[PDB]
């Protein structure tokens, strides 16, 4: 704001037009920053580089979980119905992070490739991520399911946000989705951005089925109530035969939450 008395302060922009408009000595700094911030795939087989993930092999289901809550849900519920092997991960240097982006491969029928990536992708690396994960023109038979959690102070309504009920589930489905929805769709005034939006946009523009699931929780730290709230998801053809043991999975989820991850010491 006002650094000192009487200083003229420019009005902060909203659209983003504050950006301004080269000599060789400056010509390289940009490329150094770009190479540091560039995204590369480092599938941990032997310092590999890899061409795209879907080029070497096809698949039918590519469920992706983004966010710590979604990763916990997938690692707790659907892991004991078979054995999974790792195919690769990615490395990122966003200033907000670095915590992994490892994919999973089932030793059974390989149509399922559930992913876990809690890393926060920047606002520009997402397009490169899509380019290096899918490619340019994939098949027209895949089904994509995305599970994410957002803060409750995003839903807009006439009533008070605090007065709103417990965390709930909302869905956004593309045109090419014959299956019905298990929860009411998101209202018009609310929109979603970043990686789930990029995935949904790519799926919509390339004419392949997709489905989006959101959770408007009031707490961002991982817990049991919010992850348990994802129960009604396990009733659709997107993920039906991958669940085989509910109570032991609940017990192992309780044990994982018992680890008492480092919370925030700013509050009490």
């Amino acid at each position: 704001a006002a650094t000192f008395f009487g200083e003229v302060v420019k009005a902060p922009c909203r659209a983003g037009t504050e950006d301004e408009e080269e000599t060789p000595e400056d010509r390289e700094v940009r490329l150094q920053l770009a190479r540091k911030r560039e995204v590369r795939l480092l599938r941990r087989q032997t310092k590999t580089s890899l061409v795209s993930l879907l080029e070497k092999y096809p698949c039918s289901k590519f469920i992706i979980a983004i966010g710590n809550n979604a990763v916990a849900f997938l690692s707790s519920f659907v892991m004991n119905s078979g054995v999974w092997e790792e195919v690769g991960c990615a490395k990122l240097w966003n200033e907000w992070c670095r915590a992994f982006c490892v994919f999973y491969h089932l030793k059974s029928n390989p149509s399922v490739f559930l992913c876990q990536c809690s890393c926060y992708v920047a606002e520009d690396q997402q397009y490169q991520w899509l380019e290096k994960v899918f490619g340019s023109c994939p098949r027209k038979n895949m089904q994509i399911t995305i599970l994410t959690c957002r803060h409750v102070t995003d839903y807009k309504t006439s009533e008070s946000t605090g007065s709103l009920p417990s965390p709930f589930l909302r869905a956004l489905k593309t045109q090419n989705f014959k299956d019905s929805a298990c929860c009411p769709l998101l209202e018009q005034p609310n929109i979603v951005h970043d990686l789930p939006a990029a995935v949904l946009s790519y799926c919509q523009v390339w004419k392949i089925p997709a489905i989006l699931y959101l959770c408007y929780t009031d707490v961002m730290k991982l817990d049991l109530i919010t992850v348990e709230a994802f129960k009604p998801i396990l009733s659709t053809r997107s993920l039906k035969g991958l669940v085989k043991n509910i109570p032991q999975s609940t017990e192992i989820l309780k044990k994982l939450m018992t680890t008492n991850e480092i919370q925030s010491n700013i509050y009490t």
Binding site: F4, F5, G6, E7, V8
Partner: protein, 229 residues
């Protein structure tokens, strides 16, 4: 231009945008003329109170200081009364010590410094005003002009104010030194006539002389006599 809008920042060529803007503002004001002669000086100006609804008394332009210093503004009306009061206070402050009246030059330097002091600071606008002051010390007449930033000059026939370039061009071919006040007053009246947008009337001229008696201000009927003559 981002480098504008603030008087504490230099544009990347060497200048101060606010100072030049204030100079243009004081240029866009009311014409004034000052003539220095071997016997004395004359200061002539006109007022915007053309309508008869106004009054001749009360508000007035050429306010005397002490007995030998008289000024005239060519800028913003409500923005020089404080400066005039400060000038009178400084004159009295000098008079209590050094029991002899202020010479003109010290007063010019002090008022220039106090005016400049609102340039180098940050967060306050410069004064929009530029004033001539006339003195009479050591048997000599003195004339000076002050700028919004503050830089006194030993001017002789300045016609600063609105359309001052035409006044300067007209005066650069009439003054020839070795003159009395009688011809100087007529020359000043002609300079005002050159750019007035109308005819001079009995209540549009506020000439004031500073001969070796003091700072007598000409009475309206005396101004009528000179205007007729």
């Amino acid at each position: 231009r981002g480098y504008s809008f603030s008087l504490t920042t230099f544009s990347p060529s060497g200048k101060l945008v606010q100072i030049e803007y204030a100079l243009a503002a004081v240029a866009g004001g009311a014409p004034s003329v000052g003539i220095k002669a071997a016997n004395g000086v004359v200061l002539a100006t006109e007022k915007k109170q053309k309508s008869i609804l106004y009054d001749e008394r009360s508000v007035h332009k050429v306010e005397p200081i002490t007995k030998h210093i008289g000024l005239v503004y060519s800028g913003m009306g409500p923005d020089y009364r404080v400066l005039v009061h400060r000038a009178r206070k400084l004159a009295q402050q000098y008079y209590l010590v050094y029991q002899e009246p202020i010479p003109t030059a010290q007063l010019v330097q002090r008022v220039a410094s106090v005016m400049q002091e609102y340039t180098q600071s940050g967060g306050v606008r410069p004064f929009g005003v530029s004033l001539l002051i006339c003195g009479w010390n050591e048997g000599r007449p003195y004339l000076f002009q002050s700028d919004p930033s503050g830089a006194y000059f030993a001017w002789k026939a300045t016609a600063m104010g609105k359309n001052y370039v035409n006044g300067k061009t007209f005066l650069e071919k009439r003054y020839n030194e070795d003159l009395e006040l009688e011809d100087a007053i007529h020359t000043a009246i002609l300079t005002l006539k050159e750019s007035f947008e109308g005819q001079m009337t009995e209540d549009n001229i506020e000439v004031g002389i500073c001969n070796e008696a003091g700072f007598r201000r000409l009475t309206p009927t005396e101004v009528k006599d000179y205007l007729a003559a």
